[PDB]
Subunit: 33 residues, 3 copies
């Protein structure tokens, strides 16, 4: 159970990081995004 | 404890999915968004 | 293990909340964002 929750949490960390990069690019207009 | 953390994690999965849909719509201009 | 996962999950909750605020501001044009 705990090891599987570790997996889900790390998967969420990656998804959140990807969202952060995309949202920062939209906010700041990076490379015309 | 573990069952409650499962709940928090699934709640985060849904919030992240909703954010992904919204960010993809902004990036791609879906339906004029 | 469990206490550390609680920490990671709450950190994700804060990151997701910040993303939600930023995405809602982009969607709605709050304050010219």
């Amino acid at each position: 159970e705990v090891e599987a929750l570790e997996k889900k949490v790390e998967a969420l960390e990656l998804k959140v990081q990807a969202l952060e990069k995309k949202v920062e690019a939209l906010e700041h207009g990076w490379d015309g995004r």
